[PDB]
Design a protein around this ligand. Structure first.
Ligand SMILES: CC(C)CC(=O)C(=O)O
Ligand SMILES: CC(C)CC(=O)C(=O)O
Ligand SMILES: CC(C)C[C@H](N)C(=O)O
Ligand SMILES: CC(C)C[C@H](N)C(=O)O
Ligand SMILES: [Zn+2]
Ligand SMILES: [Zn+2]
Lengths: 577, 575
């Protein structure tokens, strides 16, 4: 159970701090400087602001995949690979094919099926045993180019307790691997081979030893500015604060031999919740490249989140060179592949991150939005192309395909739930959002009364009295409609044709100055039985004669056909409100 | 939808980087130094400091966390969170915004009237600067033995312009008038040890010189002393840049604020760029005294800084957080109950997966580390559980937080059908169909072939050739249908009436021995546009001349005809 800390305060603890010593076994843990080494008074990274995208490398198919409760099926691997290509990643670690037969099979498939674009380089992980390196080259046979990423653990702790080995011995593991790579590359001249070396558990390794091993590997590989080597420096375990990782990167960047022939790569994990920070400060410290995963998947606490890194650049005016314009599509694909949810509060992608619940936040957002519109109007400009200036929202949610949501509480609650339970309507999410904004400007009765005044009651400018639907009998035929409607109270007769009743009615309305451009449509039964009422919902960008507004309409009727027509009328009248 | 970046690479972009420019509208966003101001601090010292003591913690779960929930805390859940925070060792706890929320008001009353506050705990209440709101705040706190009144107003460049439409002098006056009102009210309420906190809200969007001015001026009104200090709390209301810049701003504030001996400098970072924990740790190294956050990072949007990560980050580097985390599962269970939001599988220290190793190589290394520890423990007559933790891949002994190390040794139907085929299957259909799939990994193309074979292709026993729908012109009138169908290859006419075309068609089928009792029905567009195809789904209990529960699926350019196809598909599924 939880025991309130009751030990004495620290000597010198201020009297305004009444905290007490816990009984947690702090004696079993040491500061980083004592655990590993003291690490740079003339650092420059604190004075550098990132002004370009790094070279990204996506490791979802390897570090991500091996961290899953359910590793990816062949379909899932391919869907993830295709997503990363489409987003614009050019280096993608496709697996560990020498250690994993399913990974071997996957690398063969993408090579043999021509799934790899000419500007994409696949990367494959291997440990250093020579038979594993041979299997690695074999997996990539026929690729036009590939990165062979080999590694071994170099940390003080692993050298002692895992290897029981001296510095020379652990270095030879790496340099023997490098020699084997050079030998294998010569055997496969139809592939442009490139190399990446990681001193694994780098953050548990003396910098001078990490440098010595990388330098020695480079001597074997013999890279040049035209054919560089990647030295990848992982926080295999995140051990300390990100400024210390950044100092370590700046030291490596300054001190590694033949720096002009090196692409310096970062591989941070998230044990202390600071991976994103480690990557950003590390990149400012001189790194060239960052490995991570979409939405921070990967071993234990995960690899650094590539989404957060990329949009942290976008939102400060730096092009990440990756497309995040539909973050929900990225999220849904990632959740399908990984079978792990993106958290409600995850930066940029989480369900709740574009929501405002506080009245004062909602008011300030509205004011920001209004002021942007006023400035756009004066500059004869599209508000969506102008400087984003809205309190509480770091980005326009529309720039990643999301929507600002002003959430209104119902005093189990919530608009969606009450509407379904009390009134039998399942509102599409975008309707819930639009309606809540209306409510914003509540008891169940107030919410219902507001819903009916908005969507169900209006009879101006458009009322639909009755209609004759002439549907062709054969599949693929035309449906035509003549409708009796009142336009601002004036009875008239409209006619249109289309591929169904909704299309026909939309076309009939166009002739009388309601342009209804349909964006979406949903319908459901409000109970069981073939004689149930149907509730229909239509989303439309609507322009009325004598600018366009995207709005929803709702229609309810015993005929599935008529319910959809009522939803169109509802939408038109909502656009006039 | 996702379009591969195709724009020209940047001038000077290295040849070994073949990334192309995205079409994201980056011109709508400016660097932080242009949006707000450049870094004012000279000779920073935070990069050279390693934290060696716990800060003063303040938990804001009951205010910032609570107001951010879709299902806000009931009175029972509030008390449970309050009790947890007390039992963990928190000494400052923000219990609500009582002048804005009657439920918060009642909760503050409850804990004061019940004598629920330990002698070493100070409750904290948030208020805006308006004098009636300040009055109602002191009303809520009436009878508290001690209380922090935390008043604030927005000071950012942006909010001054578009929210308040006010200048610097006017916005400073709002703060300084709120402070005067606080002093007046405190003098009217005896006995209570009143203490104050002021936040320049949206501090990260505010010029530092100006934030310093407003704070100084508020401090002049309150007149704090080293024995009765004021808290200046500097929020990253929105996390706007990298955590080193936030830390630079805190160092500058700590070095430049007046009456520094009478100031507790407090941080309140939110997580919009994923760096709240870093902002707090570097900020603390920069001279702050105090950190506001929530357990497991609840709070507006991306949340407040995680108190659990911050506390255990100290513990795992040998610094006592002065908070008990010895049973993180209990903490997590209680937080999940109170917030009704899960702790993510990968959340530092508390997530489901954070002490699991799936790699055979990692598991080997972990065992070797545990063995060397056990060896040393024997060679020293010590319990291993009290020795220095020395285990690859595991930053802490999971047992130290009441957890265990775990050496551990699916159709995608909804996603595939929606993504590749534009069908949003009803949940019960997803279930029914994934059962067909399980029986048959089946690839996406095989899944589609099976779906078509089941719901779309069958033409026996029932085939619908064509039909005439005679729809009611008037709302509430009868709709009739007559259709030409084939019943096991035999062409026949069916006809029926009902309150709509679906009811008419099922009445028509009943005459020929196909009894379709409809249980549910859904339809949606398969793309944008008024000419889009509709997909319809009908659930029914079908009896062919017994109550077989089935789904049918229909696709057509007519909303009406798609529904008729779905009825036919259900009948054929039933046979
Ligand atoms: C080769 C390394 C990058 C292995 C790894 O994932 C790590 O060290 O974190
Ligand atoms: C008074 C402030 C600390 C309000 C707040 O929650 C914030 O600025 O983040
Ligand atoms: C699917 C719908 C948006 C409309 C359909 N094309 C009809 O006219 O009935
Ligand atoms: C709501 C639906 C199940 C059917 C509706 N009664 C119709 O006949 O069109
Ligand atoms: Zn890794
Ligand atoms: Zn906050």
């Amino acid at each position: 159970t939880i025991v309130k800390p009751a030990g004495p305060p620290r000597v010198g603890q201020p009297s305004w701090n009444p905290q007490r010593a816990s009984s947690m076994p702090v004696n079993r843990y040491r500061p980083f400087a004592e655990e590993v080494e003291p690490i740079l008074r003339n650092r420059t990274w604190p004075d550098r602001v990132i002004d370009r995208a790094p070279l990204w490398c996506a490791v979802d198919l390897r570090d991500g995949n091996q961290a899953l409760i359910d590793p990816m099926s062949p379909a899932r691997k391919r869907r993830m690979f295709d997503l990363l290509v489409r987003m614009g990643y050019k280096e993608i670690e496709v697996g560990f094919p020498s250690a994993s037969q399913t990974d071997f099979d996957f690398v063969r498939e993408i090579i043999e099926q021509g799934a790899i674009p000419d500007d994409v380089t696949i990367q494959v992980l291997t440990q250093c045993r020579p038979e594993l390196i041979e299997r690695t080259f074999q997996a990539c046979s026929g690729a036009p180019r590939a990165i062979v990423h080999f590694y071994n653990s170099t940390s003080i702790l692993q050298r002692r307790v895992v290897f029981r080995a001296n510095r020379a011995e652990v270095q030879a593991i790496a340099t023997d691997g490098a020699r084997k790579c050079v030998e294998q590359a010569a055997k496969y001249p139809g592939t442009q081979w490139r190399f990446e070396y990681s001193p694994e558990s780098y953050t548990g390794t003396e910098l001078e030893y990490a440098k010595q091993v990388c330098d020695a590997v480079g001597e074997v590989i013999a890279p040049t500015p035209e054919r560089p080597i990647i030295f990848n420096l992982p926080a295999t375990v995140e051990m300390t604060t990100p400024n210390v990782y950044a100092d370590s990167i700046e030291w490596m960047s300054r001190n590694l031999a033949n720096r002009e022939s090196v692409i310096l790569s970062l591989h941070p994990h998230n044990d202390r919740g600071t991976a994103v920070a480690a990557a950003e400060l590390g990149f400012a410290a001189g790194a060239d490249r960052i490995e991570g995963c979409l939405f921070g998947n990967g071993e234990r606490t995960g690899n650094v989140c590539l989404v957060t890194l990329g949009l942290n650049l976008f939102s400060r005016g730096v092009d990440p060179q990756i497309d995040f314009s539909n973050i929900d599509e990225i999220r849904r694909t990632v959740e399908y592949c990984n079978q792990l949810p993106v958290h409600e509060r995850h930066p940029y992608g989480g369900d709740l991150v574009y929501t405002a619940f506080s009245g004062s936040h909602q008011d300030a957002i509205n004011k920001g939005l209004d002021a942007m519109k006023l400035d756009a109007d004066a500059a004869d400009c599209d508000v969506d192309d102008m400087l984003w200036q809205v309190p509480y929202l770091p980005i326009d949610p529309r720039d990643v395909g999301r929507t600002y949501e002003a959430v209104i509480r119902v005093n189990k609650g919530g608009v969606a739930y009450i509407m379904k339970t009390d009134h039998g309507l399942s509102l599409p999410r975008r309707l819930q959002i639009e309606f809540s904004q209306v409510i914003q400007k509540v008891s169940p009765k107030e919410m219902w009364d507001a819903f009916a005044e908005e969507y169900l009651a209006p009879v101006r400018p458009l009322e639909r009295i009755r209609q004759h639907v002439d549907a062709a009998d054969d599949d693929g035929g035309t449906t035509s409609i003549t409708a009796t409607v009142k336009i601002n109270g004036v009875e008239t007769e409209i006619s249109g044709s289309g591929n169904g009743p909704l299309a026909a009615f939309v076309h009939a309305l166009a002739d009388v100055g309601f342009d209804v451009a349909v964006l979406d449509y949903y319908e459901h039964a409000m109970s069981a039985g073939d004689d149930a009422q149907a509730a229909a919902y239509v989303e439309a960008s609507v322009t009325i004669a004598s600018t366009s507004k995207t709005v929803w309409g709702v229609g309810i009727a015993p005929s599935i056909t008529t319910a959809s027509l009522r939803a169109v009328v509802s939408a038109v009248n909502r656009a006039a409100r």
